[PDB]
């Protein structure tokens with residue numbers, strides 16, 4: 188697809204990345220998966236998040252919630268809504284907290300944002316997670 | 331970890347597997363990730379699920395729901411509760427629909443089940459999905 192307005196290209200092969208976590212956002216009626224590239228997954232598992240290392244890429248995949256036709260108390264993914272990315276590069280992206288933000292919308296993978304300054308929107312909320320290097324997600328615990 | 335009572339060993343390396351989907355089970359207050367080995371992932375993506383191919387392994391990972399401390403409308407994983415597996419081998423597990431069922435509990439990874447017949451409990455619900463080869467999960471759609 189086209190690059191984001193800030194020049195970030197869609198990372199190839201994100202659908203094959205390893206899982207960091209999952210979430211449900213009540214207020215938007217979605218389910219999400221949080222994946223990362225191998226730098227991000229190694230950092231997440233080792234607790235090297237203060238700060239995250241350069242080269243880490245986080246992706247959040249979002250779907251509308253639907254209910255399973257055979258088991259109504261199971262909320263399961265419906266339509267795909269968006270892919271959100273954060274790319275760590277402390278020098279390149281110093282103006283947005285050391286992260287390159289990007290979003291692509293829908294199955295059509297339309298880049299989000301009116302202009303190259305769109306990431307200030309993202310920062311508006313993510314600045315609340317400054318103490319955790321602008322990342323809300325806590326990696327899910329596994330054995 | 332100890333093998334399940336039906337002889338199934340815990341698949342090594344499952345935390346490095348690719349994502350098939352995610353879910354939320356309302357009645358359990360759990361968030362879940364569904365991963366699969368590469369045989370399962372290929373089959374899921376290609377629609378070769380009638381029946382699933384031998385060697386496919388699905389894993390469901392479950393965590394208690396907890397709300398994010400910075401964003402209370404975000405439901406996120408808390409304590410890890412269990413890993414559920416289904417191993418396809420049509421001939422070997424013909425008596426349980428062609429799938430080997432197994433569950434390990436908690437971080438401590440205690441095998442579930444009183445005896446080797448424990449998988450009948452799993453079949454009790456999964457038989458409702460018999461027309462879909464005993465699998466409820468619909469692979470999440472991605473571009």
Ligand code: HEC
Pocket residue numbers: 209210211212219221245246247271272273288289290299306308309310311312313321322323324325398401404
């Ligand atoms: C999740 C996110 C992720 C994963 C990394 C993380 O911080 O956990 C990415 C790559 C990303 N966002 Fe943001 N986002 C918010 C919250 C609370 C969470 C965690 C809970 C969940 O799984 O949903 C996020 C909050 C917000 C927010 C507040 C209303 C805004 C405006 C944004 N996020 C905006 C953005 C982006 C702007 C286009 C962007 C690329 C994001 N988030 C990336």
Ligand code: HEC
Pocket residue numbers: 258261352353354355362364388389390414415416431432433442449451452453454455456464465466467468
């Ligand atoms: C999910 C499951 C998975 C993933 C494959 C699938 O069928 O989607 C595995 C490997 C597994 N179960 Fe089962 N299970 C149930 C439902 C509705 C879902 C889909 C929704 C979700 O993501 O949670 C499942 C339902 C039930 C159920 C009804 C009360 C029982 C008793 C069980 N499941 C039991 C078992 C197992 C017995 C130990 C076992 C190994 C399972 N499930 C594996």
